[PDB]
Subunit: 36 residues, 10 copies
């Protein structure tokens, strides 16, 4: 049903630059329940 | 039914620059229930 | 049903640059329950 | 049902650069329960 | 059901560079319970 | 500024019952950037 | 600024019952960047 | 700034009961970057 | 800044009961970068 | 900055009971990088 999901940041820092980044709590989760 | 979802920020910082970014709680989740 | 998900940041630091990054809590998780 | 998920950051540091990175709590986990 | 998941960072450090990295708590874990 | 947030589901299953539940991607995340 | 967050499900299963539950990707994460 | 976060599920199983549970990828993670 | 986080499930199994549980990938992780 | 984190499950099994539990990949990890 579902996809396939890429994550690809480019990230460049020049001469006297300052850069931060962060990622958290990302992904796939699912449930099934099947009863006679 | 569903997709496939890319995430790709470009991010550039010049000479005396300051840059921050953040990401959280992103993804796919689904449920099924199937009963006789 | 689901995908296959790549993660690939490029990351470049110039002459006097400063760069940080971080990642946490990423992946796949699922559940089944099946009862007669 | 599920994928196969690559993780591959490229990471370059120039002449007087400074770079940090981090990763934690990433993977797959699942459950089954099956009762007569 | 599941995948097979590669991890392969490239990592380059130039002349006067400084680079750190880290990884922790990554893998697969699962459970079964089966009752008559 | 913020709270403190409890999560406490009660959950009861009778004689021949069937019950599933799930939770994912829940928490707090924040950012600061402070520049002279 | 922030809280302190309890998680405490009660969970009861009767005579011939069936019950499943799950939790994933929950917690706190934050970032600082401070530049002269 | 942050809390202190308890996790304490109660969990009871009666005579012919069946019960499963699971937890994964939970905790705290943070970053600092400080540049002259 | 941060807490101190207890984990304490109670867990009871009656006469003919069946019970499973699981935990994985839980803890604290952090990073610093400090540059002149 | 951080805590001190207890883990203490209670766990009781009655007359004809069956009980399993598991824990893995739990702890603290951190990084520093400090450059002149």
């Amino acid at each position: 049903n579902f996809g396939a999901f890429s994550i690809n940041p480019a990230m460049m820092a020049a001469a006297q630059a300052a850069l931060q980044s962060s990622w958290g709590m990302m992904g796939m989760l699912a449930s099934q329940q099947n009863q006679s």
